[PDB]
Ligand binder design. Structure first.
Ligand SMILES: NC1N=CNC2C1C=CN2[C@@H]1O[C@H](COc2ccc3cccnc3c2)[C@@H](O)[C@H]1O
Lengths: 303, 625
């Protein structure tokens, strides 16, 4: 029962992101088979996902979804293998998904993308070792930075200052950035960095995960605990006042931690790589995860 | 006019994507064999039991296509030299898995990156693959002209780029490749796909890479400039390099996305095609040499081997040599004959090793143009060649004999000679035993006679060439010393090589040898200033000769006679390559040795480090008397 959406959604689930009203966004690539492409989905009902028949809207992208994020409420910002950043927007009825733009700007796979706190600008990171800043309104690249000497693993916009963002790379550099300096980047002193999360209540603090499964904690103004057996893929802070830290890894497991990085939850519900997490707005003990085993799982987290 | 493929890291539909590329004018496609983000667990459950097909079916193209149109790319996540163990292992598996699929498909080549300094475990995995089953996929190492690190933007406040000139620190990507191919004992299946950035290094680096097995150049869209009309183009510095590469007949790979949007994407190719059209077309020598590029051959031995009819035929087609010989004889006749003696005095001229008579014709031509009188002899030990001479003699001469079949050392002349003319010269001048042959014949030269040629001198230069090193390696034969092939000269049109220092003279011979004893052996020590770091693989041999006064022939590259193809460079290999550091001197020693029956060369390297003496007692190589 799908309207202008596709017959079957690709097996490899990459992204899962609730919005304001408690609706679920799904990015999917097919990383094996005749046809190597990607798809986008809205589930007004989270519990029905990933049922193609029980979706609200869906669409096919030319190629693979490496990462996406929301852009307010009607907008989806996407990183194609094509080397493109794509901006799609929901129709008025919220029943179609439509390519607003798709500029081919990176010389390789776009691997990461974060929206800046303004909402009128975003920053993407690629395997071509180039970090670029986009104005979404004008659909152009304002600046392109080759700070790094290797593939750009992950980029995360400041939640508050709209000229600050983190970046990490195979070249083993974590970078704190300010667009307002003539030299906008700063290195921050082993194993490679793999995921980045800002603390939501400190302009000053953030967590990174390494290729070895150690989660680390830092404010530029080190505390750590080895959470995982394989590389940390992802780190999303809960919405609570004193908030919880969801971490997910290629070891097919999900942990939720407290402020001291002490482990309070575990799920080998997953049987392939865990690739995302996103907490509900309508519930803050509801954690949703997706992985390459095609399982949308809805965990209840004790607090 | 130029072979070129397209690099992509994104192929949604292999069918349509290959077609688009073909529409653009390309000849092959470098693509991934597995999805570059599809990462695989070989050891830990549950991930190791990931169901379904690991990649797309081989049925998706003709075997023909797979064999011709596709180049495989190792997934970027595969990092066999990771500091993390688990990664290092999954990487070992993944790599073999990908290379094994590449073998299954009969891919013509496969791309692997050199993008850090330590590729030891990567070398080793590829060495096991190369020695596992039977397959002849080529291996193209993607190595950058400059490390991504050394052309990062200077935009880290607390980590600035070095404003100093580091000589080694901007040569660093060659040591990466060198170390990798050295570990793989120079496998002939491992070549260089050289990546070009926006900044080029100093020209010393650029000289370095030629002499390395570059099968592919990689041009990112990002380095291309725009012209008046808004089309993709390159700087004069980048073009000069492209011209240099076209000369090596490499393949060209356009990578990255379309930066000149309004102007289409087949336009980059057209600039390459345009550049190829507009370079100087090959000269006579170069047209003649096409095919013989870096092709090792045994140097001819006309003294103890009888040359073929067709071997003589090609040497006779040499324009400049016999024109020079004619001219030399003309001057000599004038210098020897005063005008008032024009018809009283007739010169006694003897061609020694007369072959099929090209020097005889030269003498006739000289006689007329100088308006002097000569009496001609033709001495020829090759009886098969004598048949040519005697037929022509019988048909067009009858003036006495003198096509006299004999060895010039053997022959008893009916009278002493004014002038003796010979073409006994080899690529290393004295290596066809011209000295020994003419010393034999010397007694029938008049006490004030002239020999053409009057004197010749050989020249050596140290060379770096990993291609030529392998070519010699592959001359290893059964039923002889395993390192015999390193202890003999090869005649070869050196192409893929680097000349580390200027040629200097080795051995010189004058005719006649007026003085007594007349020992023909020699020992000579030479020292070569080396401007770069490098690897010594052996020594080029060239020669020049004085036919008469200012009349010369020369294969010395700087003074090379124009369009003279009768000789090519000779090569003296060394068993083990000797590393050289910039500023060091290379010291080589060469001996000419002989006995009653044979003449040979021995040679050695004494600086910076010592080599084993090569060809001791002519055990691997001799020249028969
Ligand atoms: N002791 C000897 N007594 C009589 N005849 C002798 C002899 C030694 C050699 N010969 C004769 O000399 C001719 C060599 O000619 C060439 C022609 C072209 C060449 C091109 C490149 C290099 N080398 C070349 C040599 C042959 O005719 C051979 O029989």
């Amino acid at each position: 029962l799908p309207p202008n959406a596709p017959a079957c959604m690709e097996r490899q689930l990459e992204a899962a992101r609730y919005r304001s009203d408690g609706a679920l966004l799904l990015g999917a690539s097919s990383l094996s088979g005749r046809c190597w492409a990607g798809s986008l989905w809205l589930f007004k009902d989270p519990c029905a996902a990933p049922n193609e028949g029980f979706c609200s809207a869906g669409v096919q992208t030319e190629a693979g979804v490496a990462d996406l994020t929301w852009v307010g409420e009607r907008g989806i910002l996407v990183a194609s293998d094509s080397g493109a950043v794509e901006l799609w927007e929901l129709d008025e009825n919220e029943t179609l998904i439509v390519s607003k733009f798709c500029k081919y700007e990176h010389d390789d796979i776009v691997s990461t993308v974060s929206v800046l706190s303004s909402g009128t600008q975003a920053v993407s990171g690629s395997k071509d070792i180039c970090i670029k800043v986009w104005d979404l309104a004008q659909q152009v690249v304002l600046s392109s930075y080759r700070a790094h000497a290797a593939q750009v693993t992950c980029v995360a916009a400041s939640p508050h200052k709209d000229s600050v963002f983190l970046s990490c790379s195979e070249d083993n550099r974590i970078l704190l950035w300010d667009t307002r300096c003539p030299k906008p980047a700063s290195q921050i002193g082993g194993y490679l960095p793999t995921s980045l999360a800002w603390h939501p209540q400190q302009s000053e603090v953030f967590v990174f995960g390494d290729e070895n499964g150690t989660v680390s904690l830092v404010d530029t103004k080190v505390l750590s605990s080895a959470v995982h057996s394989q590389c940390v893929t992802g780190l999303v802070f809960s919405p609570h006042s004193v908030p919880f830290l969801a971490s997910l890894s290629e070891d097919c497991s999900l942990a939720v931690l407290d402020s001291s990085l002490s482990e309070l939850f575990r799920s080998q519900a997953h049987r392939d790589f865990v690739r995302d997490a996103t907490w509900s707005p309508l519930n803050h003990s509801l954690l949703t995860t997706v992985g390459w085993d095609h399982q949308v799982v809805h965990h209840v987290v004790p607090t | 006019r130029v072979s070129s493929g397209r690099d992509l890291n994104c192929v949604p539909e292999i069918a349509d994507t290959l077609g688009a590329v073909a529409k653009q004018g390309f000849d092959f496609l470098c693509m991934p064999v597995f999805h570059p983000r599809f990462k695989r667990e070989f050891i830990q459950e549950p991930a190791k039991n990931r169901p379904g097909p690991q990649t797309r079916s081989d049925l998706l193209l003709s075997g023909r296509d797979w064999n011709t149109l596709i180049v495989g790319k190792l997934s970027p996540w595969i990092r066999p030299d990771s500091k993390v163990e688990k990664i290092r292992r999954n990487s070992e598996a993944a790599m073999l898995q990908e290379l094994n699929f590449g073998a299954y498909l009969g891919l013509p080549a496969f791309l692997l990156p050199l993008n850090q300094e330590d590729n030891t475990n990567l070398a080793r995995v590829l060495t096991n693959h190369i020695h596992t089953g039977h397959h002849s996929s080529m291996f193209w190492m993607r190595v950058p002209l400059v490390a991504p690190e050394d052309l990062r933007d200077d935009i880290i406040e607390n980590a600035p780029t070095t404003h100093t000139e580091e000589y080694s620190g901007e040569e660093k990507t060659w040591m990466w490749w060198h170390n990798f191919r050295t570990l793989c004992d120079y496998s002939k299946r491992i070549a260089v796909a050289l990546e070009i950035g926006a900044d080029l290094p100093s020209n010393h680096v650029i000289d370095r890479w030629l002499g390395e097995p570059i099968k592919a150049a990689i041009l990112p869209t990002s380095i291309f400039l725009t012209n008046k009309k808004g089309f993709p183009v390159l700087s004069k510095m980048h073009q000069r390099l492209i011209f240099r590469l076209l000369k090596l007949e490499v393949q060209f790979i356009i990578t990255g996305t379309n930066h000149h949007s309004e102007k289409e994407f087949c336009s980059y190719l057209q600039y390459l095609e345009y550049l190829s059209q507009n370079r100087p077309p090959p000269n006579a020598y170069e047209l003649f040499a096409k095919g013989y590029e870096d092709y090792l051959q045994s140097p001819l031995q006309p003294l103890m081997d009888n040359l073929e009819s067709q071997t003589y035929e090609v040497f006779e087609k040499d324009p400049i040599k016999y024109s020079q010989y004619q001219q030399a004889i003309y001057k000599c006749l004038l210098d020897r004959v005063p005008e008032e003696e024009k018809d009283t005095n007739v010169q006694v001229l003897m061609v020694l090793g007369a072959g099929r008579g090209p020097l005889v014709n030269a003498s006739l031509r000289a006689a007329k143009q100088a308006d002097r009188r000569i009496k001609l002899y033709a001495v020829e030990k090759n009886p098969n060649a004598v048949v040519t001479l005697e037929n022509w003699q019988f048909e067009e001469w009858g003036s006495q004999v003198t096509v006299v079949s004999s060895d010039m050392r053997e022959w008893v002349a009916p009278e002493k000679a004014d002038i003796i003319v010979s073409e006994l010269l080899g690529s290393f001048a004295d290596n066809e035993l011209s000295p020994e042959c003419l010393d034999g014949a010397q007694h029938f030269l008049k006490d004030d006679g002239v020999s053409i040629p009057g004197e010749y001198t050989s020249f050596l230069a140290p060379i770096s060439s990993s291609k030529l090193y392998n070519e010699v390696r592959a001359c290893r034969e059964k039923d002889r010393d395993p390192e015999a092939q390193f202890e003999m000269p090869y005649v070869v049109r050196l192409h893929n090589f680097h000349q580390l220092s200027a040629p200097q003279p080795c051995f010189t011979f004058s005719h006649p040898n007026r003085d007594p004893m007349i020992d023909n052996n020699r020992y000579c020590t030479l020292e070569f200033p080396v401007e770069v770091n490098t690897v010594l693989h052996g020594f080029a041999g060239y020669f020049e000769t004085v036919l008469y006064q200012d009349i010369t022939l020369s294969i010395r590259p700087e003074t090379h006679s124009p369009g003279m193809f009768s000789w090519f460079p000779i090569l003296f290999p060394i068993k083990q390559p000797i590393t050289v550091r910039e500023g060091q001197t290379i010291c080589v020693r060469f001996w000419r040795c002989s006995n009653s029956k044979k003449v040979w060369y021995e040679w050695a390297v004494t600086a910076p480090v010592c080599s084993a003496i090569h060809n001791p007692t002519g055990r691997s190589y001799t020249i028969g008397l």
